Amino acid sequence: HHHHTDPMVSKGEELFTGVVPILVELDGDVNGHKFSVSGEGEGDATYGKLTLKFICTTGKLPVPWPTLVTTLVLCFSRYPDHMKQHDFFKSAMPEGYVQERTIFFKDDGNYKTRAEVKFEGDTLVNRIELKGIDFKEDGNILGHKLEYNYNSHNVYIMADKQKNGIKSNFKIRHNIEDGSVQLADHYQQNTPIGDGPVLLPDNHYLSTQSKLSKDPNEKRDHMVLLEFVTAAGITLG
């Protein structure tokens, strides 16, 4: 069923055995265009697999769906057995963690995000606030000039010992419809909500694949997301 020598690893693995229902909530304001997004689906940490469908509940999303993928749940990452001592994300559960980002779109505006990821009963909830400022109303984001797709990448995770958390910097490239690229430079920090101990990782990376699709029967503005996330970059074992 599951068997680790470390009872701290056992506790976190316990919560993520089987398929866990996910509820995402986002409240957003980009250049004063207010919008909300609601997402539902399932995570299976055994396979690093997430399936989610998001709806814009206020009408038309004022930014391209691909720009929200990173913002709209890294506790579903598959950590190999020999790396389970490095899984900060599950160790923080069920009380959960805060995930803060600044996302700089090159030659354009920035998103600031704050999210609380935690269990409400059996359901893993991701509650997000997004503020976006300094966007060009002729630009690739408010102009909707990005392709509806996502590109595979490897992200590095490092411990922030002093915060009892983690930090990460990484770049996302978004395809523009002319074959060029829009860079989104992400700065991330995560901190525990609870006062109890967490697993602080050695340096490693997450390998992430994402596929974006549409529900042919859906008339609301929406995104269907299939994501795989796998931890790597530690050999020992």
UniProtKB/Swiss-Prot annotation:
Substitution effect: N203S: In EBFP1.2; shifts the excitation and emission spectra to shorter wavelengths and increases quantum yields compared to BFP
Effect on the protein upon substituting S152P? Increases fluorescence at warmer temperatures such as 37 degrees Celsius
- Cross-referenced SUPFAM superfamilies: GFP-like
What changing S207F does, per the record, is: In H9; increases fluorescence at 395 nm excitation
Q: Which domain of life is it from?
A: Eukaryota
Task: Give the consequence of mutating I133V.
Answer: In EBFP2.0; shifts the excitation and emission spectra to shorter wavelengths and increases quantum yields compared to BFP
**Tissue specificity note:** Photocytes.
A Pfam family matched by this chain, by name? GFP
Q: Summarize what the UniProt record says about post-translational modification.
A: Contains a chromophore consisting of modified amino acid residues. Maturation of the chromophore requires nothing other than molecular oxygen.
What outcome follows a substitution of T208I?
Suppresses the 475 nm excitation peak, leaving only the shorter wavelength peak at 399 nm. In H9; increases fluorescence at 395 nm excitation
Q: What is the effect of changing S180G?
A: In GFPA; leads to enhanced fluorescence at 37 degrees Celsius. In Venus; leads to yellow fluorescence, improved maturation and reduced environmental sensitivity
Q: Could you mention a single GO BP entry for this protein?
A: generation of precursor metabolites and energy
Mutagenesis / variant outcome for changing V198A: In mut1.5; shifts fluorescence lifetime from 3.03 to 2.72 ns
* Family note: Belongs to the GFP family.
Q: How does it assemble?
A: Monomer.
Q: What does this protein do?
A: Energy-transfer acceptor. Its role is to transduce the blue chemiluminescence of the protein aequorin into green fluorescent light by energy transfer. Fluoresces in vivo upon receiving energy from the Ca(2+)-activated photoprotein aequorin.
What is the name of the protein in this document? Green fluorescent protein
Q: Which organism is it from?
A: Aequorea victoria
**The organism's taxonomic lineage, starting at the top:** Eukaryota, Metazoa, Cnidaria, Hydrozoa, Hydroidolina
The gene name on file is GFP
